[PDB]
């Protein structure tokens, strides 16, 4: 008789994995013992299609950080997680002064210390994050670009003047909370090709669902 599970909040709860940073010792990948991750909630595959059910949305995100070595090991290493709000400058190097700009919230924690966890508010200067924008910002490559949907960047790095002694891997989970949505719309039935637009494969246009032989046979 109850329908608590079919609510928006119920549907979008759960902290999913949306990011993974690699900080190897020897490597082509993030060679300066640091990394910048612009917040992308599409990071959880399944996500995109779920949110793209609505035209507008609003919510808060709870971020939880999981860090270990590639084998999932724990070591005595301290870390800095920096959140650079949109409009704030991300660090270009492992010594950029951005790391010390008070206006960039930062949180420190040892790998041993349990997961780091913080809540981030509804940033957008607009009244709601909008997944679809039918226009351009005052044939073009700026089509469908609602920038005021930026949540910010997360800069991660080993604390200290020198490179870390261990190879590290950070995982970022994100639980969406206090959700409100407007204007529902057709469930994506075609495969996604790009993170930006809704473009699809005009050759590989598949029928929404399983087909059959005749309309008289089951």
């Amino acid at each position: 008789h109850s329908t608590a599970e079919t609510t928006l909040d119920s549907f979008f709860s759960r902290a999913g994995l949306v990011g993974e940073i690699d900080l190897p010792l020897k490597g082509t990948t993030n060679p300066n013992g640091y990394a910048n991750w612009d917040i992308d909630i599409t990071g959880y595959a399944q996500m995109r299609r779920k949110v793209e059910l609505f035209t507008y949305m609003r919510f808060d995100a709870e971020f939880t950080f999981v860090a270990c070595t590639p084998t999932g090991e724990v070591v005595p290493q301290l870390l800095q997680y920096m959140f650079v709000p949109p409009g704030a400058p991300k660090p270009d190097s492992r010594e950029s002064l951005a790391w010390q700009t008070a206006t960039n919230p930062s949180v420190f924690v040892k790998l041993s210390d349990p997961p780091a966890q913080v809540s981030v508010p509804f940033m957008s200067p607009a009244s709601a994050y909008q997944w679809f924008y039918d226009g351009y910002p005052t044939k073009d490559l700026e089509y469908g670009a609602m920038p005021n949907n930026m949540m910010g960047t997360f800069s991660v790095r080993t604390v200290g003047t020198s490179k870390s002694k261990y190879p590290l891997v950070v995982r970022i989970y994100m639980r969406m909370k206090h959700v409100r949505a407007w204007i529902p719309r057709p469930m994506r039935n075609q495969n996604y090709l790009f993170k930006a637009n809704p473009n699809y494969a005009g050759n590989s246009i598949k029928p929404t669902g399983a087909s059959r032989t005749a309309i008289t046979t089951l």
């Binding site: 351009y136 057709p186 469930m187 637009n197 246009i205 929404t208």
Partner: protein, 237 residues
Amino acid sequence: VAQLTIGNSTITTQEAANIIVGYGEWPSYCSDSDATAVDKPTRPDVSVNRFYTLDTKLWEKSSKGWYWKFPDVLTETGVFGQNAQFHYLYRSGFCIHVQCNASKFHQGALLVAVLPEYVIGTVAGGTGTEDTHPPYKQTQPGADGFELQHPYVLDAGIPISQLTVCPHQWINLRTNNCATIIVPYINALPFDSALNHCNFGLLVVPISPLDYDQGATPVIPITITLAPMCSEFAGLR
């Protein structure tokens, strides 16, 4: 049957079929305690708000479907296209009316719905590896509109089979011919650009194909007449 008038525009329409007030809201104005309470936004009543009757599109057996963008369609047309252009901000509601003229010997069914932030997605090269962005003639067709090329996914990768989830109305030739829809201003902001952002797009597609025996008129004229409701503008240029 009777005819209603709004200024110098007089349309002959049926008494009062079922109208669809999208999302249960009526296109209203915006109070004084807003973002721009200084630049008191002037609200057109005179000519600006009346009956525009767009170039009738001809339904065919092979027709795939049509769509127009808003407010784009009118920013070209008359004294309304006048305001939309030489003004900084815009908010406006819409009364849309779609009618066909066919003998009781034609058959068809057109779904007519409105979709906020209708973002077109092209084919992307074909094989899926070209990041081609829809042109300007495809993103804002004007008052002539534009034809779908992949109706099934509404040229955007979404089943049309689910378009009914939007303010829609049906036009089954063997029952009705005129469909009406009231649309409120829908956007993440109180006001916005009238030339850069198309709050929504009018969609009209043949779900059941047009048909008739040889000898009956082969094309069914679809006439879109529409009127702006509680339209406002701010910052003249």
